[PDB]
Amino acid sequence: WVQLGAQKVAISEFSRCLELLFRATPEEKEQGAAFNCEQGCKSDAALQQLRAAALISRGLEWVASGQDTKALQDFLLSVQMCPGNRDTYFHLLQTLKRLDRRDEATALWWRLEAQTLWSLPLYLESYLSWIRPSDRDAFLEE
Amino acid sequence: MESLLQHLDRFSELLAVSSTTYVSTWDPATVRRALQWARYLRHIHRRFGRHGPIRTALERRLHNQWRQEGGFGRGPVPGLANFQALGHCDVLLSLRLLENRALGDAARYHLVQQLFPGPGVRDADEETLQESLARLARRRSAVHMLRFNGYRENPNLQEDSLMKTQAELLLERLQEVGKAEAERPARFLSSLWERLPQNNFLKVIAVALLQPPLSGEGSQVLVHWLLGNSEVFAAFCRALPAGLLTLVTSRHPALSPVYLGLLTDWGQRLHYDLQKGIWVGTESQDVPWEELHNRFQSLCQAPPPLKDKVLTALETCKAQDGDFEVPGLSIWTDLLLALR
Numbered sequence: 001w002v003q004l005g006a007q008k009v010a011i012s013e014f015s016r017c018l019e020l021l022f023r024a025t026p027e028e029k030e031q032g033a034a035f036n037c038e039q040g041c042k043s044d045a046a047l048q049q050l051r052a053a054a055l056i057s058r059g060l061e062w063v064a065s066g067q068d069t070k071a072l073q074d075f076l077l078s079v080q081m082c083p084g085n086r087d088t089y090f091h092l093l094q095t096l097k098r099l100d101r102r103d104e105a106t107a108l109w110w111r112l113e114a115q116t117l118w119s120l121p122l123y124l125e126s127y128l129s130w131i132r133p134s135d136r137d138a139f140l141e142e
Numbered sequence: 143m144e145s146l147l148q149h150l151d152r153f154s155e156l157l158a159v160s161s162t163t164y165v166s167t168w169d170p171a172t173v174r175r176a177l178q179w180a181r182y183l184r185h186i187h188r189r190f191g192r193h194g195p196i197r198t199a200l201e202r203r204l205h206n207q208w209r210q211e212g213g214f215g216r217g218p219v220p221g222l223a224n225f226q227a228l229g230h231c232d233v234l235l236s237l238r239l240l241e242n243r244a245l246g247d248a249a250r251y252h253l254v255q256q257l258f259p260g261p262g263v264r265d266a267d268e269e270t271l272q273e274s275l276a277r278l279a280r281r282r283s284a285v286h287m288l289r290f291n292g293y294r295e296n297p298n299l300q301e302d303s304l305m306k307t308q309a310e311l312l313l314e315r316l317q318e319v320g321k322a323e324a325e326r327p328a329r330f331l332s333s334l335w336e337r338l339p340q341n342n343f344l345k346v347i348a349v350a351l352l353q354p355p356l357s358g359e360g361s362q363v364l365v366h367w368l369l370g371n372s373e374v375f376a377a378f379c380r381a382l383p384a385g386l387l388t389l390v391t392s393r394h395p396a397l398s399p400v401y402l403g404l405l406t407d408w409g410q411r412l413h414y415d416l417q418k419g420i421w422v423g424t425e426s427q428d429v430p431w432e433e434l435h436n437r438f439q440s441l442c443q444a445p446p447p448l449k450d451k452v453l454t455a456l457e458t459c460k461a462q463d464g465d466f467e468v469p470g471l472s473i474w475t476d477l478l479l480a481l482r
């Protein structure tokens with residue numbers, strides 16, 4: 001819907017994804033009731049990367065609408081969730097460079113250099129490679 | 143007519159000094175004079191206390207006394223509070239002298255001997271002072287005994303028995319100020335607001351807004367006072383329970399558009415966190431989700447004249463913040479979802 005240009009229904013769907021992600025657990029191996037995905041639809045790495053993906057894809061629509069405070073909330077939450085993706089940090093720091101540059105940006109720079117793929121599904125890998133901007137490292141050394 | 147003014151004001155001065163610790167010069171003569179004057183007032187109240195210019199003259203004198211004193215600074219002296227207290231002025235005087243430790247011995251003896259002579263005077267035509275004090279002791283005992291053996295703080299405050307009593311006193315006390323017309327009721331109420339405990343006072347206002355009339359000019363005054371004073375109404379709607387405010391608002395439509403406006407502003411300063419599926423506030427004094435849900439649920443479980451009002455006020459505030467139909471985006475969508 002984003003590529004078709006529909007902010008409202010896009011944000012609707014991202015929010016629905018987020019509700020299902022936080023108000024439910026995929027790793028409910030209490031009752032073995034069927035055939036199930038052993039590895040792809042269980043991985044906590046897949047869960048966190050996917051949380052982060054949906055937060056970012058929502059924040060960019062808030063940016064499009066002019067609600068940078070909500071966008072900041074989503075990007076901050078994605079950084080709290082997956083601190084080792086760096087797309088989170090790029091988006092967050094672009095927003096902070098727009099609004100309140102100096103102190104917060106450097107505070108997160110130091111977090112990045114304190115921090116510095118395992119087995120993801122391909123639908124997630126390809127979703128991230130699609131949304132990520134080419135000017136990431138150029139902006140992150142600025 | 144004019145003869146009673148100098149009687150009544152002199153007696154009131156004597157009464158007011160009764161409670162005060164200057165008692166050295168007193169004697170049996172002073173006490174006898176006091177109690178015969180009090181008998182005279184109690185006789186007036188019986189003879190021509192109803193339906194004449196004299197009653198209204200005495201009321202003017204009493205209420206003018208209680209407002210020229212006001213209740214600020216030099217002494218918050220009660221005084222005899224109203225024309226009905228004319229019929230038991232003697233009892234007040236006697237009680238105040240029995241509480242004054244500074245009373246002299248011979249005065250004390252003469253007093254108590256005149257109050258409680260014994261059963262030598264078992265046969266009397268007029269209900270005497272001894273019987274009056276006995277009946278008072280019985281009532282005080284009865285009140286203690288019911289309060290601690292059978293009484294329960296009813297949750298529907300409007301049907302409680304303490305709040306209902308306080309309320310009727312307030313309403314009578316506003317009626318007299320209205321008839322006086324010297325100072326406006328709002329000034330009395332504003333002074334009360336500074337003076338006495340707020341939490342108690344607000345429950346009492348809430349209750350007085352619902353008692354039916356007995357002479358509803360009383361409630362009509364408090365609505366004006368509240369709509370004039372926003373700060374009190376901020377704590378009014380905040381402190382009380384839900385159904386009381388609901389019944390108040392349904393009784394008085396003038397309180398409805400402001401009350402929803404108060405609630406509409408408390409939602410807007412919440413924020414949703416995704417990890418715990420709960421709206422929360424930034425500051426600690428921001429109304430929680432549960433309390434706000436309770437208020438809107440009570441308002442929806444009400445007569446139809448208010449249901450449509452609150453429902454339209456919620457829909458117009460939903461559409462104002464994006465007409466979403468999914469949770470995590472609008473407190474108002476989340477309310478309307480939780481009501482169903």
Ligand SMILES: [Zn+2]
Pocket residue numbers: 037040041
């Ligand atoms: Zn799978």
